[PDB]
Curated annotation (Swiss-Prot), chains A, B:
Enzyme Commission numbers on file: 5.3.1.1
Phylogenetic classification of the source organism: Eukaryota, Discoba, Euglenozoa, Kinetoplastea, Metakinetoplastina
Protein name in UniProt: Triosephosphate isomerase, glycosomal
Catalytic activity field: D-glyceraldehyde 3-phosphate = dihydroxyacetone phosphate
A Pfam match: TIM
Active site feature: 94 (electrophile), 166 (proton acceptor)
A GO cellular component entry from the record: cytoplasm
Family: Belongs to the triosephosphate isomerase family.
Chief location bin: other
Any coiled-coil regions, as ranges: none
GO biological process: gluconeogenesis; glyceraldehyde-3-phosphate biosynthetic process; glycerol catabolic process; glycolytic process
Organism the protein comes from: Trypanosoma brucei brucei
HAMAP family registered for this protein in UniProt: TIM_B
Subcellular location: Glycosome
Miscellaneous note of the record: The enzyme contains a high proportion of positively-charged residues in beta-barrels V and VII (compared to the homologous regions in other triose isomerase sequences). Since 2 clusters of positive charges located at precise distances on the molecular surface are common to 4 glycosomal enzymes, it has been speculated that this might represent a signal for entry into glycosomes.
Length: 249, 249
């Protein structure tokens, strides 16, 4: 059987206290009858209200970024501060932070290693841009990204790691990933993990699809062998997210 | 007389729920007999707790950073999110963000302009490094930083602007800034604001000192004509911060 699935909401830099409370109320009233870990990654500001008001036992809260240590880093939030706040999940290496906020493969890898060392479950993001895919460089780009992460982990650390594959090449470019394309990318990742880390690790690793997913297409995506759930963007701010959760049966 | 002073606590990337709760209780218990605006700039994570627990009527709460607009910017917090969260003050362009997190003069200027346009009070940070000061380039660097900010503002906008001068050249470099050196920098800034914006704006602009401020040296720094308060770092995490507040007369 496939490993336990994950349905993660990446709210990105969005939400009002009122609009997000509506979503949390919906989640609290949702019947989830199978084993799936649901994750709500809100902005730092909204963690207080999500921690307080989420009552559904299958949900955990998550941060969308951090730096490794507390200190003289005005504007940033550290892993120790998040752990003290009760936050045990984190999304790291998102394509938007790789593109906009200076996160090289090695900076992402050090953040993931610090987060694992600090007791987080880590959703580590990798994926290639349209420039990189159109020039036939999916494999070099994606394997280089996960290899950089792997160099700062030991085998036992992968129990705390989740990989999200972002098809950045299909992000607002009008291009679209088929489920077969997503499976092929996930299969590439799992093959590397099996060979470099171990077949035992690869067998239980969650690889989440981080492309455009909605209530309509989620079930078809999840039926691919190497898809273990989702890191959802825009649909995670919509009632639609419930359908993405139930699609991981 | 000098304009209303500001005593701003930049907690930076620091704090536990317990440690900040105890610090807030001390601030709540503090009697402040003179007219001064106190500011607590916490991490994004701690804004809810600070909103709940900080009750001293001479204190307001500030963020330490933001981006201009909500949207697909994973890990970041936007001005509309902060305004929905009841946060109306913000520190922008801190030397640590100019150093580590890609904030050029122009990026700082655009963030300040968006914050003013969104109704924030803005503590906008400028200041030169050791290499810049020793190269004779204090004036060129600091006035170029504030010029980039100023070119996006109309005269009326300066009612919402506070300048913080950071002597980065004395921040863990083995150098110490004297009250006379602080005065010289503040006078330089005010003179430029007078010449380029207006004598009326310059007369009432708060220019805060953002170097090493503690309970000892605060009083001698505030005695200078053109020092209007402090953006306090390490000492703002300590009881010592109340003495810095009381040194603003």
């Amino acid at each position: 059987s496939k490993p336990q699935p994950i349905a993660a909401a990446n709210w990105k830099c969005n939400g009002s206290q009122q609009s997000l409370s509506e979503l949390i109320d919906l989640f609290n009233s949702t019947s989830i009858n199978h084993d799936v870990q649901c994750v709500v990654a809100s902005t730092f500001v909204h963690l207080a209200m999500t921690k307080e008001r989420l009552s559904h036992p299958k949900f955990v809260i998550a941060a969308q970024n951090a730096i490794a240590k507390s200190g003289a880093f005005t504007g940033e939030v550290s892993l120790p501060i998040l752990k003290d706040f009760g936050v045990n999940w984190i999304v790291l290496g998102h394509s938007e932070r790789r593109a906009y906020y200076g996160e090289t493969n090695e900076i992402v890898a050090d953040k993931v290693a610090a987060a694992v060392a600090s007791g987080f479950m880590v959703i580590a993001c990798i994926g290639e841009t349209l420039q990189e895919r159109e020039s036939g460089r999916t494999a070099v780009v994606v394997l280089t990204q996960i290899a950089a992460i792997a160099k700062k982990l030991k085998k036992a650390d992968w129990a705390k790691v989740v990989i999200a594959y972002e098809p950045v090449w299909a992000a607002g470019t009008g291009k679209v990933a088929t489920p077969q394309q997503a499976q092929e990318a996930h299969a590439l990742i799992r093959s590397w993990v099996s060979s470099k880390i171990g077949a035992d690790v690869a067998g239980e690793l969650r690889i989440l699809y981080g492309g455009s997913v909605n209530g309509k297409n989620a079930r078809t995506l999840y039926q691919q062998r190497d898809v273990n759930g989702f890191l959802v963007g825009g649909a995670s701010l919509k009632p639609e997210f419930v359908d993405i959760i139930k699609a991981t049966q």
